């Protein structure tokens, strides 16, 4: 693995993400003034636990879609078997989602956007999952305190899918062998860009497993 290579894999890691990233960002925080009136909020809390796990069931499925673009378009996942691309992406694709979302979440005010305008973590209440909720605000926040820039996001959520001890793979090595140069990509990067000090700053990354098995009780595929 040269160094021109590892630079290679950065650019092509991060147009990949470029292309799949679903909104543009500069929309996102260009509409961080759009927020919603006590009685638009309103309108969602009065809807019910189905309406509202429909309306975000299907958002996660537009998402996880755009994250099997991503991995998709990773140079050496589309070279491992499918038994491995399906289980990296059953176990990942969400984790991805959540730290995608970091994105639209608005420290400032502590809203997230959500169908076109910002809101705060009361416009979920008719899930009936307030502490799973306030735990995503709580990650949300804790990603936007870095100031988690395009690229950064691009290559941990790439660290995020390519992960080599994820229980189901066949071809472990083939795995490690891209997992390890995504790590020399992302350090790399990071050197380049005078970033190292975010990695101590990172949540572990059981936690970010932790939000999904330890707090999902699925119900709904
Ligand atoms: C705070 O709670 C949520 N906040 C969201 C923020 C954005 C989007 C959104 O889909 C989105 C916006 C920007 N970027 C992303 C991406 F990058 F993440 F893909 C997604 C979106 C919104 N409005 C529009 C037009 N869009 C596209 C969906 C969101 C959902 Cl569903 C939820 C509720 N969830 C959370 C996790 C779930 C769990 F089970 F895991 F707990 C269950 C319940």
Not at 91 to 99: D, K, P, Q, R, Y
Not at 148 to 158: G, N, P
Not at 201 to 212: I, N, Q, V, Y
Request: overall charge neutral.
């Amino acid at each position: 693995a040269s160094l021109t290579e590892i630079e290679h894999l950065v650019q092509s890691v991060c147009k990949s993400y470029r292309e799949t990233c679903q909104l543009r960002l500069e929309d996102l925080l260009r509409q961080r003034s759009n927020i919603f009136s006590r009685e638009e909020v309103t309108g969602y809390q009065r809807k019910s636990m189905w309406e509202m796990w429909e309306r975000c069931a299907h958002h996660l499925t537009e998402a996880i879609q755009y994250v099997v673009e991503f991995a998709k378009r990773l140079s050496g996942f589309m070279e491992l078997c499918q038994n491995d691309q399906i289980v990296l992406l059953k176990a990942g694709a969400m984790e991805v989602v959540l730290v995608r979302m970091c994105r639209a979440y608005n420290a400032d005010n502590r809203t997230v956007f959500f169908e076109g305008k910002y809101g705060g973590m009361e416009l979920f209440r008719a899930l009936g999952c307030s502490e799973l909720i306030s735990s995503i605000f709580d990650f949300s926040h804790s990603l936007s305190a870095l100031h988690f820039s395009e690229d950064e996001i691009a290559l941990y959520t790439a660290l995020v899918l390519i992960n080599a001890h994820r229980p189901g793979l066949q071809e472990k090595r083939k795995v490690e062998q891209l997992q390890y140069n995504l790590e020399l990509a992302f350090h790399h990067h990071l050197c380049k860009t005078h970033r190292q000090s975010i990695l101590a700053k990172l949540p572990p990354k059981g936690k970010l497993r932790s939000l999904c098995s330890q707090h999902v009780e699925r119900l709904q595929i």
